[PDB]
Every structure is written in C-alpha cells, then in structure tokens.
C-alpha cells in the first residue's frame, strides 16, 4: 500500500531575500540571489520555471536603482543556458492587459521555450506559483517572483531541495500541467492522463533521506481543476497541518483574508479561519499569525485579524496572537513601485513544515495556481527547527507590530493600522 | 402537493415577565406570563399538555420567604383545579441530575394530573429543556418561562400565546407526544418514529394560517435530531434559514450564546450559528444586533467569542455586528433569591421573519437537548414581527443594555462577561 521510498541524498536549505536596510542584530541563510545563481551555474540538462511575472531589470520597472543589479545578473545568467544546451521551459501567467515582456523576449532569443498560461480563461484565476526545477534533481519553491525587487527590496522565504530527483520529478508533474495549458487551444481535461498522477500525497508521503535522517515529504497543488489522481489539494494539505498541531501554529503570510476576494457578490470563506479557531479552542494550540502590511494591503483584513486576536482566554487556553510585519522605507525606497513588504508564505508547527506560494485567501485554493511542500521529520535541529527560528526572529523583531500600534510610528505606509 | 391550509382564526400575543424594579418609561400592551397562564387555565375544558424542564412554583420549593412567589403559588393552585374538573392534564418533565423533592408534581398527581419524567440524559445525553403548554388542542404557550414562581416576578421572559389555532396546536402536540412516549418506563428512541408523529408543516411547506386577520406562514421546529420524525424541521435548520434569508437586519436576544458543545471533554468548537451571522454581515451587509444576558452564573468563556463577533464592524465592507449585554439589576435582597435577576429571552427577528425558541444558542441545544421554536413569516407592515422588533429595540436602547467595554462595577448586578 505504501509507495516506493526515495534513495536520493536530499538536502534542504531555507533561502531568504532580506531587503536593503532591514537588520537583525545577532541572528544567517544563503540569499535567494546566491541560491539562484548557484542553481544556474550548475544547470547542465534542464530548467523548468513556473512564474507569475518577469521584471528582472531597471528598464522593466522604469527605475534607475543600483539594487536592481542582482536581478539583472540573474537574467544575464538565464540567457547563457539554452546556448550551452540546457532545455529551458518557462510557464508564465497571462497578464491582465497589454504589457511588454522584455525578459521573456530576451530568453526566447537565447533559445529558451516560453508559454503564457491563460488561467483567467481556464479557472478565473492566475498562474501565481513560483518554482524552479533544475536537471530533474534540484528545485526552488517559495515566495520570490522573477523580479529584481524579489532579491533586494522585498522579504522572501523559499526552500532549495538539492540532490532529490524523486521529489524534483514529482514537482515536474505540476509544471507539465502548466506547460500543457500554455498551448493554443488548451482546455482543462475532464481527466488528466496517468503520467500527471502521483503516489506521493497526504495519505502516503514520499519517504526521503533529508540531511541524513528519514523524513516524509509531499507536494500539494492548486487549483482543483489542475489536480490529477493522487495529488493532494493545497487547501487539504494546509488544513491537515493546522488540524494535527498539538502545541503551536506559527503562520507568516503576506495576506490573510477569510473571503473569496474581488467577488461580486462578496463571499465569506472560513476554511482556514475555522481551522485556527478549532485548533486554539479544542486543543489549546498557541497560534501566532504574522501578517505583512504595506500601502497595498486590503483594508478589510484588519477587522478579520481583530476578530481572531479577540480569542485569547487564560481559562479555556484559547491563545491566538496577531502581529503586522512592516518593512521600513526611506524616501528613495518609497519611490520603487511595489517594494518594501514581506512576501513570505509559510507555516510551522511543533511537528510539521508547510512552505507555500499562495496567500491565505479563498481564490488561491479555488481558482489560482499554487504549490506547497509539506515535510515531517522525527527529531530536533532540522528544517522545521530552522523555519521556527526564522518565524521567531521576525515575530520578536522591531518590524512586527500589535494591531493597536499607531500607523504613524511603523516606518512605512500600513493600511491595517489606525491613526491611534 | 402543498398541504391543507388552516381555517382557524389564529391570534398571537407576545407575553413577557418583567422582573420587579425593571422599568421602561412610555414603552407595555403585552399581558404578563402570569396573566396569560391564568387565562389559559381558567378557559381549559378538555386537555392541558405541558413540556417542562423543572417545577418550583412555591416559596417552599426554593427555601425562600418572598411575597413575589405569590403569582407562582396561584398558578399551582389553579393547575390543581383542572383534573378534578375533568381536564386531561399531561406533564412531561426533565429527569433531574440528582435526587430532588418534587412537591409541585406530587400535588398535581394527587389532583389527578398525569406526570412522566423523561430521562433525556440516558436517551440523548441531554435534558428536556422545552417549555410549552397546549390547551384544549386549540391554544399554546411557547417561550422561555419555566414552571417557576421566579419566571413570573424575578426574571425576564419572552413567549408567545397562539389562541384559536387548533391546526398548529395539534402540530405542537405531535412534539409533546414524543416526550410523553419517552417518559414511559422501558422507552427507547425508535429507529423510525411511527407516521402519527410525522408533520406536513415545515420549512419547505409551512402552514398557511390566518394570523390576526391576514395570511401568514407558520411552522414548529424541534430538537434534538433523534426526536425528529419525517417532515419535522430541525430547530438548527429553521434558525439558520432565518439568518441565511435576512437581507436588512438580524436582532437576536438570547440568554447564552456560545459557539461550542458546552461542558464537552475534550472541548468542541461549534461555529454553525457563528459562521451564519459572519456570512450574513459580510456577504449581504446584514446589520446584526446580539443582545446577550449577563449575571453571576454567565460562563466566562462567552466574552472572547462575543468580542470576536464585535470586531466585525467596518464601514467599507458594510460588515456591522454589534453586541450588548442585558443585565437585570439586583439589590442585596433580590441577590438572595436563588437563580433570579436575569433575562431568559430566546428569540430572533429580521426584516421578514419571527423566530421564538426555548433553547440558548450553544451546540448542546441542537444535538442532545430538547427544544421547540415557532417560525412565522407574514407579508405586510406591522404584525407579530413588528411587535417583537419593538421589544428588542426597547431592551437594546434601555439603560439595562451595556457595551462589552462597560465596567463590571456599573451594571447593577454581578456580570462575568465584563472586564471591569
Ligand atoms: C393579535 O390579536 C391579539 C388578540 O386580540 C392581540 O392581543 C391583544 O392586544 C391588546 C392590545 O394591546 C391587549 O389589550 C391590552 O392589554 C394590556 C394588558 O392588560 C392586562 O394587564 C393590565 C395591567 O395589570 C396590572 O398590572 C399589575 C402588575 O403591574 C397586576 O398585578 C394587576 O393585574 C394590574 O391590574 C390589566 O389592567 C388588564 O386588565 C384589563 O383592565 C381593563 C381596564 O383598563 C378592564 O377593562 C379589564 O379588566 C381588562 O382585562 C389585563 O390583565 C392593557 O395594558 C391594555 O390596556 C390599555 O390599553 C387600552 C387600549 O389598547 C386602553 O383602553 C386601556 O385604558 C389601557 O390604557 C389593553 O387592554 C390584549 O390584552 C391582547 N389580547 C390578549 C387575549 O392577550 C394582538 O396584539 C394582535 N396582534 C397584532 C399584531 O395586531
Ligand atoms: C541540510 O544540508 C544543507 C546542505 O549542506 C545545509 O545547508 C547549508 O547550510 C550551511 C550552514 O550549516 C551553509 O554554510 C554557511 O553558508 C553561508 C554562506 O553564505 C553565503 O554568503 C556569504 C556572505 O554573503 C555576503 O557577503 C559577501 C562578502 O564578501 C558578499 O560577497 C556577498 O555578495 C553577500 O553580500 C559568503 O561568505 C559565502 O561565501 C562562501 O561560501 C561559498 C559557498 O557557499 C563559496 O563559494 C565562497 O567562496 C565563500 O567561501 C556564501 O556565498 C555562510 O555565511 C556560513 O558562514 C560560516 O562561517 C562564518 C565565518 O566564516 C560564521 O560566522 C558562520 O557562523 C558560519 O559557520 C556557512 O558557510 C551552506 O551555505 C548551506 N549549503 C547550501 C548548499 O546552501 C542545511 O542547513 C542542512 N539543514 C539542516 C542540518 O537542518
Ligand atoms: C549534492 O550532491 C553533490 C554530489 O553529486 C555534492 O557535491 C559533492 O560535495 C562533496 C562535499 O563538498 C564533495 O566531496 C564532492 O567532491 C562533490 N561532488 C561534486 C560532483 O561536486 C553536493 O555537495 C550535494 N549538494 C548538497 C547541497 O548537499
Ligand atoms: C378566540 O375565540 C373566541 C371565540 O371562540 C373569542 O371569544 C369571543 O370574543 C368575541 C369578542 O371579539 C365575543 O364576540 C364573544 O363573546 C367571545 N366568545 C366566547 C365564546 O368567549 C376570543 O376572543 C378569540 N381570541 C382570543 C385571543 O381568545
Ligand atoms: Mn502534520
Ligand atoms: Mn486547493
Ligand atoms: Mn425567512
Ligand atoms: Mn436541531
């Protein structure tokens, strides 16, 4: 009944982008930039990228920022791959309206293959997923977009899994669905062919050797129409981690909204919300929600976060806490479009790791493409402990604020704090 | 395939108990619970069915010496006259938790009334919480008032008397007959209730009645599920239908509100009603007013859940839930009366519907414990709905209603749901 184990010497590394000027005294991980350049340098056979959008250059953003150099170097290194015999396949979300695609035009000219996926037509969503699969051996999964700002001006969390071909091949099955749908005349098949199916899921995760000790790993995906036989839905994977927690649930996610956003009429979506309420009330689980805040934050989030924060009670052992993580901006940084925010999307418990591409609102689980990596591993000092340490560093930092914080005190625009 | 209409000249009267000292200047065409009950007893010629939780109609029952017990003692004296006059008196009463004297029921048995104790703890792990009277298969009382002298003079109560409505009275008797059957030695929940328990009158096809001279739709819902024969709408489904159909406002006055299965070990989260109210305000911009009672016996865990709902008020989304606590003042003399000086009302009114119940709004009342609710809709300005709305707003606007930030020192009685 249990599927075949993996014999690969899998190694996981948490990789962050830390924005220019954001300091954590006496806390270090390899950067997104360093990890990506390393993957590109080592690529010999194949590179698959699932992507939301491409702005790797100053010219793409109409800026003259020195901090765009890292993104520009990534694009220059990507351009070397197809000429040296690497099979480059890039799946990209179709943009809402007309938009120039300088990065992808450059990669096409280099010999890379590019397909735009019209998720708006197919599912009324977008291709939000961010991952790389390198030589069917290594992968990056996380929050970082193909954006120079993702390296130097926004906070990101991802994982690079090295030397893990069984899980790399499993992730490629998710990529292949995007790749298929990127073709002219494509439609959602009523039944995905057998080659898209996986044996590795919530019920029977993949047995891997992760950093020299046994672990259970699987990859969940969204949305439901893209889900072949055996593939765990992202929402099911996420709620299973919440439902199995017996001590704590720590969530760092850019946006949290228990709704189907931009819907007409508005639709309430309490799947995750009731999961967290159940955890704290039934099992006395300590919940810490670290939500990002910036000038583009949906203001409707504040009331729902205040609603969760109200469930702290010493007698029932109900204990949900909410903080807003705000990346400070100086005058120069404030001029950079869509920068100075924390893009992390992950969850860690006492027993589980969840690393995602999606924000925690309903569209990400019903219409929009996403992928998550689920790991459990008996013992201490592993991937789970490292992610918990990152969460607590951010939670305890001067960049994290209670909901009663004065908006005028936090060092960037924040739509989720009041004047008082 | 709609069922037969009722041709009876149905007349509904809202009946309240207003505790000694509780004043509403220039508000009170409502006859009292005491007045309405004495009227029903004086008119009774053939039959009286009472569903009851407990009997304490005398000072001796409560070990008190209160002049305000006189109304209860007069109700017991008038009840004792019925069986000797040839009235068939049938009393279903909840089995007590421990050994208790039953002076009132011993007196009624001596008069020739029939009494059965229903062991709901054995049958469903609940209690027989329902309060209703059916008089001559023609009139009924349904509401919050127990067979308790305190229910007349020392606690606030809300009920309805439906007069000259034999179709609906006979329909209520079918609920009574379930209690009456289960009160017999050797009883068990039948796998299927016999057809004579079934009703044609429910949420899908309510009874067409002439209510105070104009057409109305009325049905009776019941709890818990094991007592529910074919055709009978469950109380929870009836309640949630009124919430789900509201387009303007939902006004709820209920003694206790707790989105849990209370006293469960382990603790169990129960968001059925909670999510209904959140959905109403978020999806449909429904203005929700929750008027929860508070006294020294209030379960303190209610506060956090009420604060959680109150957090959903914001101008842009049109989310608008307000919570107030209704507190009956008690001086030192009033405070010595056991289990008094509290508001027992359980009802809901919207712009289009009336809900009058016997149950508090927590999970046990919809899963294990016996309850009954009357559901009425009626086209036109005014009527029963307008009268119940006027009672709600009288209580809501009164000096006895308090925001959750009110000092516990400032409400005229002990209140466990205010911080102080
Ligand atoms: C659908 O149809 C239903 C049936 O018709 C409608 O219900 C009825 O609604 C009517 C209008 O509101 C009700 O009439 C009113 O009843 C009021 C309550 O009356 C009782 O209580 C009075 C006060 O008792 C006193 O209180 C102390 C404690 O504080 C007690 O210890 C002691 O009992 C005190 O007496 C009591 O006085 C009254 O008795 C009446 O007194 C009359 C003298 O004024 C006498 O003629 C007679 O004895 C009578 O029984 C009751 O016991 C009452 O306040 C109110 O009176 C006032 O208003 C009228 C006009 O509306 C004025 O003429 C008076 O001068 C008063 O100012 C009035 O009688 C009626 O009771 C309801 N019917 C039933 C069967 O309950 C229902 O509304 C309708 N629905 C819709 C949507 O239309
Ligand atoms: C599961 O297994 C995996 C795989 O083994 C494991 O992952 C590795 O984790 C280890 C930690 O245990 C990592 O080792 C650390 O790597 C750090 C590397 O950081 C990079 O950046 C450094 C600084 O960068 C900045 O500053 C320089 C200034 O000059 C600037 O150029 C840059 O632009 C940037 O601003 C840089 O120094 C470093 O470069 C060195 O290493 C690379 C190869 O990684 C090499 O090519 C270079 O020539 C150079 O030697 C690198 O680019 C590093 O900081 C850290 O440092 C140790 O030493 C210092 C003192 O010297 C101590 O202060 C500190 O405490 C550290 O001990 C250390 O080397 C390793 O990188 C991971 N492996 C991979 C592949 O990513 C997981 O953790 C395991 N999980 C478990 C066990 O749970
Ligand atoms: C992934 O596997 C490669 C080997 O296939 C690892 O590289 C080797 O690393 C060890 C330690 O530095 C050396 O002894 C070998 O000489 C290296 N071999 C090659 C071919 O490079 C690599 O370290 C593994 N990656 C991770 C992150 O663990
Ligand atoms: C219920 O029905 C009875 C009739 O069966 C109503 O009583 C009558 O009231 C009217 C006044 O409107 C008088 O014409 C009669 O004297 C009464 N008849 C009897 C037999 O008493 C009664 O009012 C109806 N409504 C209520 C609320 O009881
Ligand atoms: Mn788990
Ligand atoms: Mn999903
Ligand atoms: Mn309705
Ligand atoms: Mn029910």
Numbering used by the authors:
A (entry chain A): 72 to 98, 101 to 493
B (entry chain B): 72 to 98, 100 to 492
Give the published text.
The deficiency of PLD3 leads to the slowed degradation of nucleic acids in lysosomes and chronic activation of nucleic acid-specific intracellular toll-like receptors. While crystal structures for RNaseT2 and DNase II are available and provide important insight into the molecular details and function of both enzymes, no experimentally determined structural information is available for the 5′ exonucleases PLD3 or PLD4. Both PLD3 and PLD4 belong to the phospholipase-D (PLD) family of phosphodiesterases, a protein family that shares a common biochemical mechanism and an H(X)K(X4)D (HKD) signature motif within their active site.
To gain insight into hPLD3 architecture, we determined the crystal structure of hPLD3 in the substrate-free (apo) form to a resolution of 1.5 Å. The hPLD3 apo structure harbors a bound phosphate in the active site, which is coordinated by five direct hydrogen bonds with the HKD/HKE motif residues His201, Lys203, Asn218, His416, and water-mediated contacts of Lys418 and Asn432. In line with the mass spectrometry data, a high mannose-type sugar (Man5GlcNAc2) was well visible in the electron density at Asn284. The electron density also indicated that the side chain of Cys300 was oxidized to sulfonic acid. Careful evaluation of the electron density in combination with an X-ray fluorescence scan of the crystal used for data collection of the hPLD3 apo structure indicated that this density corresponds to a manganese ion.
